Design a protein around this ligand. Sequence first.
Ligand code: BCL
Ligand code: BCL
Ligand code: BCL
Ligand code: BCL
Ligand code: BCL
Ligand code: BCL
Ligand code: ZE0
Ligand code: ZE0
Ligand code: ZE0
Ligand code: ZE0
Ligand code: ZE0
Lengths: 94, 49, 49, 49, 49, 49, 49, 49, 49, 49, 48, 48, 48, 48, 48, 48, 48, 48, 48
Amino acid sequence: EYKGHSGHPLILKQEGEYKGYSGEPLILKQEGEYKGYSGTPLILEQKGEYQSFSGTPLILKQEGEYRGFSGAPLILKQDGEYKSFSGYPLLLNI
Amino acid sequence: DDPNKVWPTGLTIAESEELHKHVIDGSRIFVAIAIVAHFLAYVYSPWLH
Amino acid sequence: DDPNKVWPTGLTIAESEELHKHVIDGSRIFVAIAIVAHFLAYVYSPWLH
Amino acid sequence: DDPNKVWPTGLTIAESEELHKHVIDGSRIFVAIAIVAHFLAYVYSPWLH
Amino acid sequence: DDPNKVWPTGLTIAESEELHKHVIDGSRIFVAIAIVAHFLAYVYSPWLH
Amino acid sequence: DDPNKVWPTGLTIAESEELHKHVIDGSRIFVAIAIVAHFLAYVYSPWLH
Amino acid sequence: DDPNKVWPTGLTIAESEELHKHVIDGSRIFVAIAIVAHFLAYVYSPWLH
Amino acid sequence: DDPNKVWPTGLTIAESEELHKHVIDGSRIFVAIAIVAHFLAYVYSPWLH
Amino acid sequence: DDPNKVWPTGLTIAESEELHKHVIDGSRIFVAIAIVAHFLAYVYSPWLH
Amino acid sequence: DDPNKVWPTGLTIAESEELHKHVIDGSRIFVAIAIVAHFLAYVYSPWLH
Amino acid sequence: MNQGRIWTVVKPTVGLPLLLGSVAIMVFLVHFAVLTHTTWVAKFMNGK
Amino acid sequence: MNQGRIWTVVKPTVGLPLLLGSVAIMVFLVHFAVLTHTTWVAKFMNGK
Amino acid sequence: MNQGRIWTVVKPTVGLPLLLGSVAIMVFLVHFAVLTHTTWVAKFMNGK
Amino acid sequence: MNQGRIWTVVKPTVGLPLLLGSVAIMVFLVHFAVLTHTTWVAKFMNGK
Amino acid sequence: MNQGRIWTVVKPTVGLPLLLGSVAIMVFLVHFAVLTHTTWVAKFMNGK
Amino acid sequence: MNQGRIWTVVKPTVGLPLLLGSVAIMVFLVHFAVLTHTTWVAKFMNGK
Amino acid sequence: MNQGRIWTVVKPTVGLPLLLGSVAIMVFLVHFAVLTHTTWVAKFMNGK
Amino acid sequence: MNQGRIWTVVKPTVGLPLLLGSVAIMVFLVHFAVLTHTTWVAKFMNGK
Amino acid sequence: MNQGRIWTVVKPTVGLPLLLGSVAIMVFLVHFAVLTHTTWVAKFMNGK
Ligand code: BCL
Ligand code: BCL
Ligand code: BCL
Ligand code: BCL
Ligand code: BCL
Ligand code: BCL
Ligand SMILES: CC(C)=C/C=C/C(C)=C/C=C/C(C)=C/C=C/C(C)=C/C=C/C=C(C)/C=C/C=C(C)/C=C/C=C(\C)CCCC(C)(C)O
Ligand SMILES: CC(C)=C/C=C/C(C)=C/C=C/C(C)=C/C=C/C(C)=C/C=C/C=C(C)/C=C/C=C(C)/C=C/C=C(\C)CCCC(C)(C)O
Ligand SMILES: CC(C)=C/C=C/C(C)=C/C=C/C(C)=C/C=C/C(C)=C/C=C/C=C(C)/C=C/C=C(C)/C=C/C=C(\C)CCCC(C)(C)O
Ligand SMILES: CC(C)=C/C=C/C(C)=C/C=C/C(C)=C/C=C/C(C)=C/C=C/C=C(C)/C=C/C=C(C)/C=C/C=C(\C)CCCC(C)(C)O
Ligand SMILES: CC(C)=C/C=C/C(C)=C/C=C/C(C)=C/C=C/C(C)=C/C=C/C=C(C)/C=C/C=C(C)/C=C/C=C(\C)CCCC(C)(C)O
């Protein structure tokens, strides 16, 4: 056991339960549903699809390639090798 | 599965909804306390005078 | 098959789209509240007078 | 089963509520010490005079 | 292999380019809104008068 | 179990209590040195003069 | 092996050099735009006048 | 057991205390140099004059 | 073994020294560019005039 | 065992001591350069004049 | 009250510390805002 | 409303905290900007 | 007192250091606030 | 439009939050720069 | 002295560096607070 | 152009966000430096 | 010297860097405190 | 030119980003230092 | 020259970057200290 330099005891313990100093109860228990203090309901249940506020539609469906809002093309393809936009070479190598 | 699916957070929907039940209750208590703090500020501070 | 692929985030496309459905709805409610806040500012602040 | 569930944090509900028992006690001690410090300030400072 | 290779990020080239399709489209919408904002600033602010 | 259970930190209750024994001792030594520093400040500084 | 060695980043030498090809090209485009911005500053700002 | 136990840091108590021997010896050298630094300050600076 | 040892960083000694050769040569380039910038500042700024 | 032990850092003692020999030699060169920089500041600056 | 499923996709050991911490941070920001842009709060602290 | 696949590639336990956190941060930045660059908000806080 | 289950979903080795550290930080924020927006705390520290 | 493969080597859950977050930061930095170095934005906020 | 089980749930290699580091940080905060809000500490450092 | 093997030893998902972000940061630093240490940029922003 | 078991519960590759770093940091904080709240150090730096 | 084994003990994906980032940061620090403690740099930026 | 077993307990990929980085940081802190608390360094930078 550590002696320390500041007298004895250095710690407190008990076998049964937390012996708190600030009286009792220290906690409330709950055998069932949550008993809130701000009335009910606390949450809204969702049985199926999200019954949004702020009207519908709420997302846009997509069933293929992406359609831009800013005109085609959105991407430049590549095959073979990277095309330089700033001349050649783009590297030095052994 | 679905109605008892354990999601990647380790909670079911029921456990998630139980947890959020605490989050809503805490928010309502916080607002109620803040409302009285605003009422006290209205009575004692010059704020809306 | 493609629609039932579980992506590296652990979501399907349909789960992702249901999640984003909350994000868009929240954004609309946020803007609605903000519009009324700007209307109140227009009525009571000197902002556009 | 249920009360012996080890939750993702590695605690049962009982160990969680036991841990929170220290948290509530520590909070109450903190407030009592602070109430005295506010009383001392009321006595020895111009704050509410 | 290569056109169906899954890269260390967990995407194919096709999925990477599909993702970047949103990045480019969003950037163009951003610039379009910003162009209007600079036009409004030119009309109403002293900036270039 | 309980006297020999190893908790997620890798300590028993006994080893936790032995570790905290050093924390309490260090806290007491710290406060002792601070009390001397406070006495020297009360002697030499204008603080409470 | 040697020419096809996967290095700890998960890239071959060829994939690394292909990636750096984009880095050099992007750097050159950046400098070109910056040169025009410096020329615009030389024309319209007092900078070197 | 006890002297041979490898603790969660990967050290025995003997290796832990042998490491701390360097920490203590380093602290003493640091204090010795700092004492001379305060002596030099006392000689040349106005500090305690 | 020794010359072929893969060290915990995932490099051999020869790979480490070839990598550092780029670091050394890059440092020499940086210094050369900086020497010219200091010469330019000596010519055109009042720095050492 | 002991002199051929590999420690949790992945080094032997001999590898550790050989590594530190670079750290010591680097510290000496840093000090040597700093001594001359201090000598130059003594000659050209007002510092100790 | 309809967002109850958020904790299926955001870890509670992340979002609850971030929620409570952000509220605490931003409560203090509003106090420091009103404290630095009014006289009457500083007067109330300064008292007589 | 067409970005709904963002959550197949950005983890919600990252991006939803980052979204809501950034919105809250930048709401506060706008309040601090207007508060520090106007008279009438401080006058409103200071009241009578 | 009804929040006792919080430690089933928030890790104690995160939430307790954050709880104690946040209180300690925000105790100091209130001290620095009152210290800078009053005269009498500085008088008390300055003494005679 | 030729950088479309970037997401084969930069993780989307890293680079997409970094991109959108950096752009939001850059927007606010420009607003603060113009707000602090002009009169007319403050006059616009201050209004009547 | 009754909190000695804290180290069954808070990792010592986290909580002990945080404890000692927080104390050391906040010692310096009190020194800087008193140093900046008094004259006599500056006089003591300045000496003759 | 001779450094093309850097990405065999630095991970692209680290070095590329660091590269692009560091450039964006230090672009803004040069703008803020010139904006604060000149009159003509502020005059340009302030306009008429 | 009685704390020599600290390294059975704090990782040396954490605590030793944290120790030496915190010492070096706080040495500098003391030099800056004395440098900014005295005249004689600046006079010594300024020399003739 | 004798430290070339440092990359057997320091990870290149750590030390190289740190090296380049540190030089970049500290180049900017020297620029900001000389910019703020001289007239002629600001004069050069301000031009006519 | 007697601490060289430090690298059996501190990871070199942690401690060497922290060492070199902290030295570089604190070199700059000393330069900034002397620069801001003297005239002759700014006079040297400002030249003629
Ligand atoms: C002072 C040096 C040590 C110290 C040494 C001792 C010693 C020695 C003993 C204790 C004992 C006790 N210690 Mg201890 N203890 C210190 C700090 C603390 C602090 C704290 C917040 O600082 C606390 C709460 C405690 C707690 C306690 C109790 C558990 C216990 C009973 C107290 C009592 O009334 O004893 C009785 C009262 C006293 C011991 C104090 C009497 C003081 C007299 C009146 C004045 C002496 C002046 C002196 C000569 C001045 C010059 C030298 C120095 C400036 C002190 N210690 C410091 C770090 N502690 C006791 C124990 O273990 O019991 C089993 C015990 O005998
Ligand atoms: C005072 C020292 C301890 C304390 C010791 C006790 C004791 C002893 C008991 C309780 C009990 C109770 N405690 Mg407790 N308790 C404290 C702090 C708290 C706080 C808090 C926010 O600080 C709360 C909410 C509670 C909660 C409660 C209730 C569950 C319960 C019944 C209330 C009551 O009248 O208690 C008693 C009163 C108070 C806690 C505060 C009274 C405050 C009034 C306004 C002023 C009192 C001045 C006093 C007489 C001055 C002289 C003496 C000292 C200088 C203090 N405790 C502090 C930390 N508590 C009781 C119970 O049911 O236990 C099973 C009980 O017997
Ligand atoms: C005021 C103290 C509690 C509270 C206690 C209750 C109680 C009790 C009930 C509700 C009920 C409701 N609460 Mg609640 N509730 C609070 C905070 C909130 C907040 C919020 C953002 O602050 C919200 C949105 C809600 C939401 C709701 C609805 C779900 C529901 C119907 C509202 C209604 O008009 O009821 C009618 C009107 C009211 C509840 C408000 C009455 C106001 C009057 C002037 C004063 C009340 C004094 C108070 C009850 C005294 C004791 C507590 C303290 C000493 C102050 N609560 C706080 C934390 N709430 C009711 C319900 O339908 O449950 C099924 C119900 O019975
Ligand atoms: C106003 C309260 C709700 C709202 C409730 C509804 C309702 C109800 C409906 C829609 C519908 C629509 N909504 Mg919605 N919606 C809101 C916010 C939004 C926002 C946004 C950025 O704020 C957007 C883009 C949308 C988008 C849309 C479209 C998908 C759709 C067709 C447009 C239309 O004319 O709707 C209708 C009109 C509007 C959205 C705005 C009208 C505003 C008028 C001028 C002022 C109303 C003041 C009000 C009476 C004040 C007091 C009460 C409360 C304080 C609000 N909503 C807010 C959060 N929305 C429709 C739909 O999908 O039907 C199936 C529909 O009928
Ligand atoms: C305006 C709404 C959309 C938009 C709608 C379209 C449409 C519709 C089409 C394209 C097409 C194209 N778009 Mg687009 N596009 C936008 C933003 C962009 C931006 C950008 C940086 O902002 C770029 C580089 C592009 C790129 C391109 C090319 C790939 C392609 C050929 C352009 C062209 O000159 O067509 C000819 C010219 C035009 C389409 C428009 C010219 C606009 C002029 C120069 C400016 C008018 C400003 C206006 C007054 C602003 C206020 C009104 C509204 C509030 C916006 N788009 C915005 C977000 N784009 C075309 C294509 O090839 O599709 C297959 C096509 O059909
Ligand atoms: C200007 C737009 C592009 C550009 C477009 C090209 C083109 C096109 C070519 C190169 C070529 C080269 N480029 Mg490049 N390049 C740019 C940026 C760079 C930068 C840089 C730091 O900015 C560097 C170092 C390089 C590097 C190089 C070399 C590898 C190579 C030989 C250059 C040379 O002197 O050729 C000799 C000189 C020249 C090519 C320039 C001549 C300019 C003439 C005198 C004026 C033309 C004005 C023009 C009509 C104006 C309108 C159109 C556009 C605005 C240009 N590029 C930018 C991003 N580059 C060449 C190559 O690799 O060929 C196989 C080549 O043909
Ligand atoms: C700077 C200037 C001048 C102006 C700025 C002004 C502004 C913008 C002010 C903005 C203010 C805002 C946005 C305020 C928002 C406040 C909010 C959202 C408050 C929220 C409070 C939430 C609370 C108290 C939540 C509590 C949650 C609790 C207790 C959770 C408990 C969970 C438990 C027990 C776990 C249960 C687990 C299971 C499995 C169910 O057992
Ligand atoms: C800024 C202004 C103006 C005002 C603010 C003023 C305020 C609010 C000031 C607040 C001050 C406060 C809160 C001060 C608190 C100080 C405290 C709590 C000090 C604590 C000190 C603790 C110490 C020294 C702990 C030491 C622990 C040690 C040495 C542990 C050793 C562990 C070991 C050896 C491991 C043992 C392992 C086993 C296996 C058991 O042997
Ligand atoms: C503060 C004051 C007053 C003064 C300071 C002034 C100073 C010091 C200024 C310094 C300025 C400096 C150092 C500026 C440097 C600018 C630099 C280096 C710019 C670099 C730009 C680089 C760019 C745009 C790189 C882009 C890279 C891209 C797009 C990469 C794409 C990669 C892809 C698509 C992956 C390909 C993958 C495979 C598998 C190969 O397909
Ligand atoms: C702000 C104002 C105005 C005032 C504030 C003033 C204040 C509060 C000042 C406070 C000052 C304080 C608290 C100073 C504290 C200084 C301390 C604690 C210094 C400690 C120094 C420690 C040192 C040098 C430690 C060295 C450790 C070493 C060399 C370790 C080596 C380990 C090795 C070789 C590993 C051995 C491995 C095995 C296998 C065992 O051999
Ligand atoms: C703020 C004010 C006003 C005043 C403050 C003034 C103060 C407090 C100033 C303090 C200054 C101090 C504390 C300065 C300290 C400087 C120090 C400690 C410098 C250290 C330098 C260290 C260096 C250069 C280390 C170099 C290490 C190297 C090159 C390592 C190489 C390793 C390699 C090659 C690995 C080899 C591996 C094997 C296995 C051998 O192959």
